[PDB]
C-alpha cells in the first residue's frame, strides 16, 4: 500500500503558563493529536487538578474523605495537592465570587489567590465565575494581587474580553483564556478581537467549550475537530492557539457521576462512576485536539497521565 502522507501547513503556537522550572508549554503540534506517526506533536498535553477557595460542599463523599484536613484552607489544599499528586497545574476556582451563591467582594477573593500563588511552585490557573459582569471586576483585582507569577486567567468571553484581557495579558503580563461556546466561528471571532486589542497568539489560549460525555458531547468533539483541521490544514493564523478544556467542571456534575448507591443501587459504586466519567470525557477531548485538561479526582489524573504516556511513548 501507500503510507498516508498527510502534510499540514499550519502549526499551533506555544503558550507558557507559570514561572520557574515548573512552567509548562502548550501547543506546538503540526499534526493531529497522538499522531506520532504523522509528524511532530509539539508538547505533551498537560493534566491539571481542581481546587476550591471554599470548602467543597457539593463534592462526592469519597472526594471529601481525601481532602479532610486540607479542604478548609485553600493554601493548605494547594500545597497538599502539589506534594501528593504533583499536577502539571492547579486550577483555583473562585466559587465564593459568584453572585448566584455566597457572593463576595473581588478584593476578598484576590487575597485568597495571592496566598495560593505564593505557596506553590506549580503554575496556577485561576478560574472565575459564570457571570460576565463579575469576572471583569474579579480578574482585575486578582491579576493585580498575583503579579509576577504568570497565572492563567480563565473564562474571558466576548463580553468582558476587553476588561479581562487588559487587566490580564497587557497590564500584569499574565495569560488569558479566550472562551467561546462550542463554535469554530465564535472561537475564530473572539481570537480576532484579542488580536485587534493587541494580544497575539502567544499570550492567550482558547476554550472552545466543554461538556460531559452524553450531554452535548458531540458538539464539543466536532468543534475541536474543526478548529484543529482549520488551524493546520488551512493554515488559519487566527486558530493556531492551544486549547484548554475543563473536564472536571462539567463531567463531575452529572447524575451518572454524583448519584450514590442509596439513590441508584444498580449503578454500583459512586467513586468508580465519578472517575470513569472524567476519564472518558478527558480521553475523548484529548484525542480531538485539547492541549490541557482539568480533573478533580486524583485517580482520574493517574489514568489520564498513563493514557497520555502510553500513546506518545
Amino acid at each position: 500500500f501507500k503510507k498516508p502522507t498527510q502534510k499540514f501547513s499550519g502549526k499551533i503556537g506555544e503558550v507558557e503558563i507559570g514561572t520557574g522550572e515548573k512552567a509548562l508549554k502548550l501547543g506546538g503540534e503540526s499534526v493531529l493529536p497522538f499522531y506520532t506517526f504523522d509528524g511532530d506533536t509539539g508538547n505533551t498535553p498537560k493534566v491539571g487538578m481542581e481546587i476550591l477557595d471554599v470548602y467543597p460542599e457539593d463534592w462526592i463523599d469519597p472526594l471529601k474523605d481525601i481532602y479532610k484536613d486540607v479542604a478548609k484552607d485553600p493554601v493548605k489544599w494547594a500545597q497538599f495537592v502539589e506534594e501528593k499528586y504533583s499536577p502539571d497545574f492547579i486550577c483555583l476556582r473562585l466559587i465564593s465570587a459568584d453572585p448566584n451563591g455566597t457572593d463576595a467582594a473581588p478584593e476578598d477573593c484576590a487575597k485568597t489567590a495571592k496566598a495560593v500563588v505564593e505557596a506553590i511552585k506549580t503554575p496556577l490557573v485561576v478560574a472565575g465565575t459564570g457571570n460576565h459582569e463579575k469576572d471583569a471586576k474579579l480578574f482585575e483585582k486578582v491579576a493585580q494581587e498575583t503579579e509576577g507569577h504568570n497565572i492563567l486567567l480563565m473564562s474571558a468571553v466576548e463580553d468582558n474580553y476587553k476588561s479581562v484581557g487588559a487587566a490580564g495579558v497587557m497590564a500584569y503580563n499574565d495569560k488569558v483564556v479566550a472562551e467561546s461556546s462550542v463554535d469554530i466561528n465564535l472561537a475564530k471571532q473572539i481570537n480576532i478581537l484579542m488580536n485587534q486589542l493587541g494580544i497575539d497568539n502567544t499570550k492567550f489560549v482558547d476554550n472552545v467549550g466543554c461538556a460531559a460525555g452524553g450531554y452535548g458531547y458531540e458538539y464539543v468533539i466536532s468543534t475541536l475537530d474543526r478548529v484543529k483541521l482549520a488551524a493546520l490544514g488551512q493554515d488559519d493564523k487566527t486558530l493556531q492557539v492551544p486549547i484548554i478544556s475543563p473536564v472536571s467542571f462539567e463531567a463531575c456534575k452529572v447524575k451518572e457521576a454524583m448519584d450514590s448507591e442509596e439513590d441508584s443501587p444498580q449503578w454500583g459504586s459512586q467513586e468508580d462512576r465519578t472517575v470513569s466519567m472524567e476519564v472518558a470525557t478527558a480521553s475523548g477531548v484529548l484525542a480531538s485536539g485539547t492541549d490541557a485538561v482539568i480533573l478533580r479526582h486524583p485517580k482520574s489524573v493517574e489514568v489520564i497521565r498513563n493514557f497520555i504516556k502510553e500513546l506518545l511513548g
Binding site: 460525555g213 480521553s283 475523548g284 484525542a287 489514568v303 489520564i304 493514557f307
Partner: peptide
Amino acid sequence: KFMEVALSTL
C-alpha cells in the same frame, strides 16, 4: 478498568 474506558473512548 479505568484504562479500558479511556481506550474505548479513544
